[PDB]
Amino acid sequence: YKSITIATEGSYAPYNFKDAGGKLIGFDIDLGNDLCKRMNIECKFVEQAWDGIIPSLTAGRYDAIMAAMGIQPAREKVIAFSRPYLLTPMTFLTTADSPLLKTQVAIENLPLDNITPEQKAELDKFTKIFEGVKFGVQAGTSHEAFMKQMMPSVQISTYDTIDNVVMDLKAGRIDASLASVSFLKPLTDKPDNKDLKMFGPRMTGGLFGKGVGVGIRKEDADLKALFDKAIDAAIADGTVQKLSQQWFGYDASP
């Protein structure tokens, strides 16, 4: 390899978004550039809509995906992933005045690879509390997959971008959402978003998968090995921790 093209969405701050001049910026961009430097390969970031990001990779329109993409079982059937470059649990989001905020959380950290009867009872509690609550999620995410498979009785609306989910939640068109702590903590840390709050268990595993990784075609075994070596080195020297703190305001590095 001499040069690679990496696709990103550009609508998922602080992973990948656009600055004042319309340039692609964020954790995924800074990390992507750092990894390519370690691999001694020219880096080119391209904007690609979330809907179609995976089929455009398999069609060979670019070499990789760095777009806050979770390493999840459904995606693993289609593409390969690098080892994770960020780890994050999932949690719920609502408004600061919502009665949903008064809900008792019996299980703070909820791993879903295996669901015990106790863990199922907690999921069932939230399901019943959410019956009548209007949820919004971004389409094609593990957030959508969770709500559709784990909480099918809950009314869900799917959106093209997470920005439109947040806009509808602020306007009161939806009552709650679901996303990672890595997305929600920087969102709610903004003084702009004092009217928004995280709540509920912090979930990991199951359909959420095992970390955020670089999406690569299954046949591109060499490129995966190059990315895995670069990620191991970027984690080891504290580069991932440094970039995580810079973009997220906390350490989400593996």
Ligand X SMILES: C[C@@H](N[C@@H](CCCNC(=N)N)C(=O)O)C(=O)O
Which is closer to ligand X, CB of 119 or CB of 182?
A: 182
Which is closer to ligand X, CB of 69 or CB of 110?
A: 69
Contact range with ligand X by CB under 6 A, out of 55-63, 163-171, 175-183, 194-202:
175-183
Q: Tell me the per-residue interface mask from 108 to 127 with ligand X, x by CB under 6 A, - otherwise.
A: --------------------
Which is closer to ligand X, CB of 159 or CB of 227?
A: 159
Residue 208 CB, nearest approach to ligand X (Å)? 7
Q: Considering the rule CB under 6 A, would residue 141 count as an interface residue with ligand X?
A: yes
Which is closer to ligand X, CB of 69 or CB of 226?
A: 69
Strand pairing report for 17-18 and 156-159: unpaired
Q: Considering the rule CB under 6 A, would residue 9 count as an interface residue with ligand X?
A: yes
Q: In angstroms, rounded to a whole number, what is the distance separating the alpha carbons of residues 228 and 225?
A: 5
Q: Considering the rule CB under 6 A, would residue 183 count as an interface residue with ligand X?
A: yes
Q: Which two tokens stand for residue 213?
A: 């990784």
Of positions 24, 79, 162, 207, contacts ligand X by CB under 6 A: 162
Q: Distances from the Cα of 117 to the Cαs of 114, 172, 203, in angstroms?
A: 10, 34, 16
Residue whose C-beta lies closest to ligand X: 70
Of positions 4, 35, 66, 67, contacts ligand X by CB under 6 A: 67
Of positions 25, 154, 179, 226, contacts ligand X by CB under 6 A: 179
Torsion angle of alpha carbons 221, 57, 10, 205, nearest 10°?
Answer: -60
Which is closer to ligand X, CB of 16 or CB of 244?
A: 16
Closest CA to 226 of 16, 34, 23, 38: 38
Q: Considering the rule CB under 6 A, would residue 12 count as an interface residue with ligand X?
A: yes
Of positions 48, 94, 177, 180, contacts ligand X by CB under 6 A: 180
Q: Considering the rule CB under 6 A, would residue 68 count as an interface residue with ligand X?
A: yes
Which is closer to ligand X, CB of 116 or CB of 248?
A: 248
* Contact residues for ligand X, defined by CB under 6 A: 9, 11-12, 16, 50, 67-70, 88, 90, 138, 141-142, 162, 179-180, 182-183, 212
